[PDB]
């Protein structure tokens, strides 16, 4: 298991524009197109990302390319973030994958706002962090995903992803 497989599990793969859990236009493997309510704006953003007139449909290869770019960006965002970097550097490989997942889902800004959890993770207080992470809108809105990620931080193993 790795970050790619992990997020491929969490995000799924859709080759036609769709609405995510928050009702935002997305495509591929959780690639957010826009927060705008306009499907046109979304089709526009898609063509611009893909480089061609897509008509709101992409191929698997195009989806996977967006995905690689998105993972890359997430990592890069963490490394550049003063609040995230030190956390990320302190973690083992499995847990780092769990931080990337959060960043991918909620953005660097979003995650950097979990100050208390971040601090606990940095201190390696797993159970404590897990409890604090759960007191969040994130967990109440996407409880099953949140649980998988939280378990990953708690255990440092991929057990929550084994079986899927």
Domains by residue range for the chain, with CATH = 1-164 (1.10.530.40)
Residues marked active site are found at 11, 20
Sheet of 14-19, strands arranged across? 14-19, 25-28, 31-34
14 sits in the region (left: phi over 0; alpha: psi -120 to 50; else beta) called beta
State the pairing for strand pair 14-19/25-28. antiparallel
**Contact predicate 119/132, CB 8 Å:** no
Separation between Cα atoms, residue 25 and residue 46, nearest integer Å: 10
| Residue ranges of the binding site for substrate | 32, 104, 117, 132
The two three-digit tokens of residue 118, written as one number = 């971040």
149, 123, 122, 121: which is closest to 134 by C-alpha?
149
Q: Resolution of the experimental model in angstroms, please?
A: 1.7
Give binding residues as ranges.
Answer: 32, 104, 117, 132
- Cα separation, 12 vs 67, in Å, equals 11
């Amino acid at each position: 298991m790795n970050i790619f497989e992990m997020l491929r599990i969490d995000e799924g793969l859709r080759l036609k524009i769709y609405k995510d859990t928050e009702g935002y236009y997305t495509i591929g493997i959780g690639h957010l197109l826009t927060k705008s309510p306009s499907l046109n704006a979304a089709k526009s953003e898609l063509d611009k990302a893909i480089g061609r007139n897509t008509n709101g449909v992409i191929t698997k290869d195009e989806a996977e390319k967006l995905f690689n770019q998105d993972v890359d960006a997430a990592v890069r965002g963490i490394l550049r973030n003063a609040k995230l970097k030190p956390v990320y550097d302190s973690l083992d490989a499995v847990r780092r994958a769990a931080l990337i997942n959060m960043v991918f889902q909620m953005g660097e800004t979003g995650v950097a706002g979990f100050t208390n959890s971040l601090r606990m993770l940095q201190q390696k207080r797993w159970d404590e962090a897990a409890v604090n992470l759960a007191k969040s809108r994130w967990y109440n809105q996407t409880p099953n995903r949140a649980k998988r990620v939280i378990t990953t931080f708690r255990t440092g193993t991929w057990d929550a992803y084994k079986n899927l």
